[PDB]
Amino acid sequence: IDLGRVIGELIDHRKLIISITSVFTLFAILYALLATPIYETDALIQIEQSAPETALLQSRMILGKTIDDLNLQIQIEQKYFPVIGRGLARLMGEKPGNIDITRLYLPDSDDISNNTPSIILTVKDKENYSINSDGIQLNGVVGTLLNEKGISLLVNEIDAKPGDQFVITQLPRLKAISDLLKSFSVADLGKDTGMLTLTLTGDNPKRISHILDSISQNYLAQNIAVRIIDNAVTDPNPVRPKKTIIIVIGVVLGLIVSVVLVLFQVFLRRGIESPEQLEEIGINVYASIPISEWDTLLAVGNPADLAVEAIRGLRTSLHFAMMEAKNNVLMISGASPSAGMTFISSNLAATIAITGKKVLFIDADLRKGYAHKMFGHKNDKGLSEFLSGQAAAEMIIDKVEGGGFDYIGRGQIPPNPAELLMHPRFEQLLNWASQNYDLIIIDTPPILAVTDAAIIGRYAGTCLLVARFEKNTVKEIDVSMKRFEQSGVVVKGCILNGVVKKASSYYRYGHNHYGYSYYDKK
């Protein structure tokens, strides 16, 4: 692989790459805008050492005094049902509702796991409120304390709108200490100075400054039984989430994921990429039919289609290739199902019939042939009925309206399709057809599925394989040709079908084999 190859692959997979990168960036931006902002407050303490003082500041004695003074064991959180309800409410300009509680004694369930009892407070108005611990409803008012059902609660100064719910947890003293200790850090900043930098993170900018002031003052009173230089102030710019580094990572992560997925699809695909791959093995490619964007025949409904023009090129190439053959019978056989053989063979018959030639189309796919459905069908007396002996040759030939050629349907699906084609009536039909027509085109099932095409190929003077652009493999075509040759059927060449324009073909090889549209635009 070279620079041209990888750049062509990027150009071809640009849509997948952009989609993956864009969804990654969207997730990164949604995270950076919905994650709760965490502020950081700092303070400065003058020590008259400071290494044992650092461990004393983070001790449960100093921090425990802060939990008790500020009631940090009363956890109050705004209620939001999703994991994004808090982020989007902040985006919508909704100010976070807050309630002040000074006394909270829950019945202390203290079960196997839930050591943190919780209730749900629903704001009814500015004054009164409701409480539901486990469905037990209790109505309370600011001021008057509540002592009912083993639940003591004192809510002061409800600052919110009616309908706001609040999860009120009474976490144990050690947990409240452990939460404060996890967000509280102490540094020396000079490693020799008597200066300690107390920092505290949290989602509430005002609350974390009151806590850090309490920690500094409780440590101050404890030491005198030291100087506070800078009291705790909260940085108004949140330190997390760091939006820029999250979005940039979302871009880089989306890009590298896109590349490795594209790099795998390039290294794992085995389908045909160009007619050159077939010609490298010695397989003559007579036409490359591009994908048509469009029950009528394409060569009649849209004669100017880019696919029909490539079929006209096949017509002229076949005319020079079909001379010096045994007979005027041309067999067309896809290598795999859904290769587009009936698309090519029926439109090829149309492009040759308009040239004034008498063409007979034989849908000899007794298993899955649908040429009768496509042309309009008196489905009785098809090819099956003729091979079985219950129909004459003149009774199975029909004319296509949007055609120009005669066509023979497969008939009713026989139980022994391969055995019917071996009947001598089949060769007698082709010998009779070879005298009343200029060209006989025969659709056959794929040789890698059944052997029907090998039997029919014995009576055809020219045999062509139909390969799908990306669905069929080069070796798949080579096995198909060798299977025909093993049964005495020489394949004249292959027809690549369903070619799509790709930039990687333009850089790996010097051509894309898609075809130029050519008309005066009017």
Add this chain to the structure above:
Amino acid sequence: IDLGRVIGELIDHRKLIISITSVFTLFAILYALLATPIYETDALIQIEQSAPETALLQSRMILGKTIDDLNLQIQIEQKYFPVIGRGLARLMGEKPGNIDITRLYLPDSDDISNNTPSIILTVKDKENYSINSDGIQLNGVVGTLLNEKGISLLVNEIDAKPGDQFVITQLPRLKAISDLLKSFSVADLGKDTGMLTLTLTGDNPKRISHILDSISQNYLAQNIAVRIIDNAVTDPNPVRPKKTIIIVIGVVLGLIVSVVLVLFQVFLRRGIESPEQLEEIGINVYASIPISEWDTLLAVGNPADLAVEAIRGLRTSLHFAMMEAKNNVLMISGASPSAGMTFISSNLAATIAITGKKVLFIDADLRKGYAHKMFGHKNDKGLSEFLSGQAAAEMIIDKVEGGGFDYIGRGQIPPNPAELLMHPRFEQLLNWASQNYDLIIIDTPPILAVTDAAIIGRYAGTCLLVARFEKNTVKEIDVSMKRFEQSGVVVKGCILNGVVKKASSYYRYGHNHYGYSYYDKK
């Protein structure tokens, strides 16, 4: 090997990989959820150095005082018969039963090895209990102490349900010290500060906090004859087992074990992977029969089977390959036993007999031929009886009901099978059969087992080998062909049997050689 090869191997062995990875993850999750949770309590001590104080804290003098104060030599464990009975009981929400014992004097067996005497206490109710040391049953009550059979026991406040057994061990003082010392650790956390961080691990969160408080207080009283800043509190989140790192290791370990086992099976397998391996040595492969999911013949019970369609392809390939031969006798010989020769040869005779040809099936496997059992048999007068001279040719030919062809059974297993086939009656049978039939198909034993096929191959105009997909080796086929050629029998080609769809074949080679199913689904 390339990326395509390894990815195809992963796709083919995905079931083994997923099974191994899933059982590894299941074991890891069962360990992470059944291992007893171990909590960690910590304390803070202020030293006014601290390096000799660390060694004094872990001394048997300080720790020995703790063992005596809290009776740590009385080991009490809830009784569970399996290694998982404690884990699952905790999962089921069953609270662990605990009993308080203050006096435990066992008869002190002190034998060669068991220096730790043990008894089994069975809770009968809230008040009384039972005791069985070595089968000697003793009934005791909370309160009143027990002095019987040299066993002193004082159980206080039994907190459990009736039926809970308890193993009560009286371990020596040094062992109790060694157990505490193993879970007790001392650190300085500043390497200069007078701060010591005493930590203690254990399965009981309340007990380890009482022990660490005792250690701190016994060290405190001993030093004043120092300040305890933070008393021992237990972290409610267990430090072990670390579930996430155990499960993630279970995933990674299952994956790497799956890969190396798959990597060995890929590097150790020698069987045929595709018909290309045979054709690389110059062995013509006339058909690749896929594995049929299905005593009737497959070509009659299910004519539309994917295996029968590949046999129809063999029929058309054989017709073109059998012309220009000496006679109409086709010999089919597997390279190894259970290669599927009789599956192919009997179904091939059916697919050719429906074409209106007279086919004779000769089961010339006088050792293990079971064609008579498969078709319905008048087992008397088979091929053996004819070669021995006790049966006429017209008396050994039988007709298959679900057939269409005539068949000759092997007969009774002769003592000299190879010698019977050398009798001139065998060639006279084939010369007679060659005049009353269009094709004679002969089953023969594998040439690498016996020489019966080499003898029969002298009279057959066409000889084909049947190879099993993965069971037979390429060289195994090459040795079989060369052994025939060494005896004057030229093998026309090979028939690969039992092909299964594999993604690795699609990436190593450009084709899988399995065959496309082709029918209108109705």
Add this chain to the structure above:
Amino acid sequence: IDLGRVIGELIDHRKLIISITSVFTLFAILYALLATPIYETDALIQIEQSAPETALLQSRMILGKTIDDLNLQIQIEQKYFPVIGRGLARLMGEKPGNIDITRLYLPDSDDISNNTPSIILTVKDKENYSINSDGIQLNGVVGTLLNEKGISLLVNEIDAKPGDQFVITQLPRLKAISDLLKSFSVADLGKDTGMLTLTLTGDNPKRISHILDSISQNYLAQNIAVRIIDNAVTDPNPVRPKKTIIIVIGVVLGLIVSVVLVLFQVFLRRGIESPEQLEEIGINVYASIPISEWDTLLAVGNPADLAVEAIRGLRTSLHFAMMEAKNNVLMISGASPSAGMTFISSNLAATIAITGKKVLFIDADLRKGYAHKMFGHKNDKGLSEFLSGQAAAEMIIDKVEGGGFDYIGRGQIPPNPAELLMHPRFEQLLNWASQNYDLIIIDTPPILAVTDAAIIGRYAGTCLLVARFEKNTVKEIDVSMKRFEQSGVVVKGCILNGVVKKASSYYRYGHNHYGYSYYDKK
């Protein structure tokens, strides 16, 4: 690639390289000249340690005293609508207007986000001024304080011109401290000395010296309740923007961007670079027509053109190449549209007609042929009308005035162009034309677009392909020739059209294939 190749590529892409480098340097110079200059003032303090004194200097206590003394919370900025209005005003010699404010109390909106209220002061004259916070207009005079609409303002000594607007923000105390702290740095400069180097950056050289003097004096008074050696003086040379390193980076960045863009265009282009690329595949190139700087024919309006001289070379090469051919019919077919086939074929007919030969020009591009428009047309009865049978051969032949040869127009665009060319009237026309003319030149559509040229090529004794210099690929030509050969049309060779002089061709190959102009300049 070698030194010659890369140097030739640089010479050929010199215009793109110079343009990119020049726009990069222009942006860098505009940045270096429009970015606001930032001055740096420094002071020297003598400490009698200095490590805790450094942290005390940057404390909010010392810096907060400076904000209050100098009213640093009153932010005054000259109003400029663009991001360059301040830079260019400084370039134009306009001195920055400044107003002195001592009292600023805004109504303190304090909404969700905007914690910094702002107003807009518009200077009306030396004495009075106007104020608009949110559209509310207020008129004030220097001296007399304003207390209206909850806005307290005291503006002293307006030094500006009437019309100058000023954004007056009252930022919070912490923000003003954070802005000063961000630009204030303290260093020791000896790491042991009692010398502290206080430095302060800012856009106002006089203001930053007053602030740093305040910081030094507030720290001096605070410490005595230390020696100031060097009072704060501002370096008159701004420390930023560093113009030289910005411009030099603009040069280097423009160069490396130019190189990588040129390096990609060289590695991504696949078009033909020289006639040697075609001859390496075995394609005979009979002429290389250079780009002509110029509805008349080029070979008549400017016979001395460099393109016409190369066509005269094609004429002499064709004369030697067209002998020993079946007939005197020459077909010319571009490989892709807009290849210049009609430019070459019509001018080639002119250069051969002046030699006294009778030439017939057949515009057989029934889809997009415009030869009739170029020569002057009685558009009725073209080639289409003749093939359809509604026009005689003698009625479709016309004479070109600026010609010398006869020409046949395409006629009205037929619905079946490819089918009309297959009519036997086409060969009868050429057989008749071959007897009344010395050479017949036939324009045809590109073979990679439609098959019209393959049909016409069957009756032409010589067939040539027209390749565009850079638009067509070598493989594109090779596919075109093989498609003709697949239809029984042998292409005699190719004609490279639109060649442009390039230095890289002179270094990769030994020639540029552009052609030397040759005339006596008079």
